[PDB]
């Protein structure tokens, strides 16, 4: 089954791998210590913790499977049907949860800057609601991807790959679903909200709350722009994967699709690693307790 092979150079594999491992350690340590101190510590801490969990899931259970079975060995898939579906399901649920957390944070900040409720119980209930909804919107992937023997006769175990098992139309529908619901719409809402939040901050600012508020505004805007920039090439690739006709696909577009895969996923991990570092760059006491928690290791 030499038709399933790709020609991505070794140096690119090693480079992208090294990047993935760097983002792995930075992201896991960052979000791990983040969850640690946040748990040891306030309304936004639940959203931040939710984000940290969302990132940790990808960094721990999606990153190794990716770096192994997607850039190093393209075939055969060695995680089974359950691993195949559970992987993409996890990814989708994660991106949905992240997006919804961002938008929710935008709303919370706007309300905390326009009028300066949501008790601890109610807030946690709402976070649970976000997670559940995220899991619900990730369901189609369980019915979209799967295992297929793409070898010449469909009998060779080396041709057992993890590929979408549904037709082009349905694939279009689910990919569009993900792109609209987890990217365009929510980040649009969050961008508008951030836009209003900025000027509201400028008009409010004309004692110690306004500085933390400014901090929150900058952090939030940073998270939004990071989300857009990082998740942009990701959604373009998935649309590129399906919308291009089978006759239009050439070897150049193939190899380029794989390099683009490397790039896009690299940025995807860059986001998950960029979440906690932004919390440190504000020079808040969070960085102090970050070094404090990082020291005892």
């Amino acid at each position: 089954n030499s038709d399933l092979d790709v020609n991505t150079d070794i140096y690119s594999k090693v480079l992208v791998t090294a990047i993935y491992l760097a983002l792995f350690v930075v992201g896991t340590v960052g979000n791990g210590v983040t969850l640690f101190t946040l748990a040891r510590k306030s309304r936004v801490d639940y959203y931040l913790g939710s984000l940290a969990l969302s990132d940790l899931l990808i960094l721990l259970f999606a990153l190794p499977v990716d770096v192994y079975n997607f850039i190093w060995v393209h075939h055969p898939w060695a995680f089974g049907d359950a691993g195949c579906k559970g992987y993409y399901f996890l990814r989708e649920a994660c991106t949905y949860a992240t997006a919804l957390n961002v938008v929710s944070l935008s709303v919370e900040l706007y309300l905390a800057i326009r009028h300066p409720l949501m008790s601890r119980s109610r807030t946690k209930k709402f976070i649970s609601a976000i997670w559940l909804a995220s899991a619900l919107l990730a369901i189609p992937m369980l019915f979209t991807v799967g295992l297929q023997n793409l070898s010449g006769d469909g009998t060779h175990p080396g041709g057992l790959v993890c590929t979408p098992i549904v037709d082009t139309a349905t694939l279009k529908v689910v990919i569009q679903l993900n792109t609209f619901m987890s990217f365009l719409f929510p980040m649009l809402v969050a961008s508008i909200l951030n836009t209003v939040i900025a000027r509201r901050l400028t008009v409010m600012v004309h004692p110690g709350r306004v500085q933390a508020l400014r901090r929150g505004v900058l952090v939030l805007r940073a998270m939004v722009i990071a989300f857009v920039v990082c998740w942009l090439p990701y959604h373009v690739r998935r649309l590129m994967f399906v919308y291009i006709s089978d006759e239009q696909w050439t070897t150049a577009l193939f190899d380029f699709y794989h390099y683009f895969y490397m790039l896009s996923n690299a940025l995807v991990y860059v986001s998950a690693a960029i979440n906690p570092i932004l919390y440190n760059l504000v020079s808040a006491n969070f960085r102090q307790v970050f070094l404090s928690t990082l020291a005892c290791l």
Partner: peptide, 7 residues
């Protein structure tokens, strides 16, 4: 000629 199988 050939189409990707990785999503």
């Amino acid at each position: 000629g050939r189409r990707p199988y990785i999503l």
